[PDB]
Design an enzyme around this catalytic site. Structure first.
Site, PDB file in Angstrom:
ATOM      1  N   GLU A  37       0.785  -1.208   0.000  1.00  0.00           N
ATOM      2  CA  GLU A  37       0.000   0.000   0.000  1.00  0.00           C
ATOM      3  C   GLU A  37       0.809   1.245   0.000  1.00  0.00           C
ATOM      4  OE1 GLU A  37      -3.819  -1.868   0.378  1.00  0.00           O
ATOM      5  OE2 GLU A  37      -3.226   0.123  -0.169  1.00  0.00           O
ATOM      6  N   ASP A  43      -6.830   6.635  -4.337  1.00  0.00           N
ATOM      7  CA  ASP A  43      -6.324   5.312  -4.504  1.00  0.00           C
ATOM      8  C   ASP A  43      -6.493   4.856  -5.950  1.00  0.00           C
ATOM      9  OD1 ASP A  43      -8.952   3.789  -2.464  1.00  0.00           O
ATOM     10  OD2 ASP A  43      -8.906   4.264  -4.569  1.00  0.00           O
TER      11      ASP A  43
END
Ligand SMILES: [Cl-]
Ligand SMILES: [Cl-]
EC number: 3.2.1.17
Length: 164
Positions: A11, A20
């Protein structure tokens, strides 16, 4: 290598609100703030999550705190889920980490939907599960990441992650 280190590689770490891979708003180590398109909605969820007027920025400590809560919640969600728990209890330590990664990424609900793969994992049919896992939007959208987790389930080792 452990779950924390594994997810931190997949991540990343950003201290300012960011979009994202799906266009949603996150912060930290893959911490989802809101699916909504407003940066304000996001700043608001963020201040509510940190307990202070952040102004879209947090420290490293704060990020790690969210991360810790998020991993814990992932595990707890797997354990309370009727379709997931059994899978999880049947796996070895490394592969359990791969199931937590998918849960943190996609939510318990999303994962519980991989019915055929879950069954194969439960049966210990590694290669078959790997092929099945690959036939998914998940794999098509984030193939590099998906490849790492799938290799993890296929091999039971941290190879896809050693070097990173
Ligand atoms: Cl929160
Ligand atoms: Cl990817």
């Amino acid at each position: 290598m452990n779950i924390f280190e594994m997810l931190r590689i997949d991540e990343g770490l950003r201290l300012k609100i960011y979009k994202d891979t799906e266009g949603y708003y996150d912060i930290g180590i893959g911490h989802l703030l809101t699916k909504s398109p407003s940066l304000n909605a996001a700043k608001s969820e963020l201040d509510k999550a940190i307990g202070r007027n952040t102004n879209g920025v947090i420290t490293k400590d704060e990020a790690e705190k969210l991360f810790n809560q998020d991993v814990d919640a992932a595990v707890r969600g797997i354990l309370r889920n009727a379709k997931l728990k059994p899978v999880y209890d049947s796996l070895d330590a490394v592969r359990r980490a791969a199931l937590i990664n998918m849960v943190f990424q996609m939510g318990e609900t999303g994962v519980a939907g991989f019915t055929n793969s879950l069954r194969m994992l439960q049966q210990k049919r590694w290669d078959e599960a790997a092929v099945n896992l690959a036939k998914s939007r998940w794999y098509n959208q984030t193939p590099n990441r998906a490849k790492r987790v799938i290799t993890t389930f296929r091999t039971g080792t941290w190879d896809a992650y050693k070097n990173l």
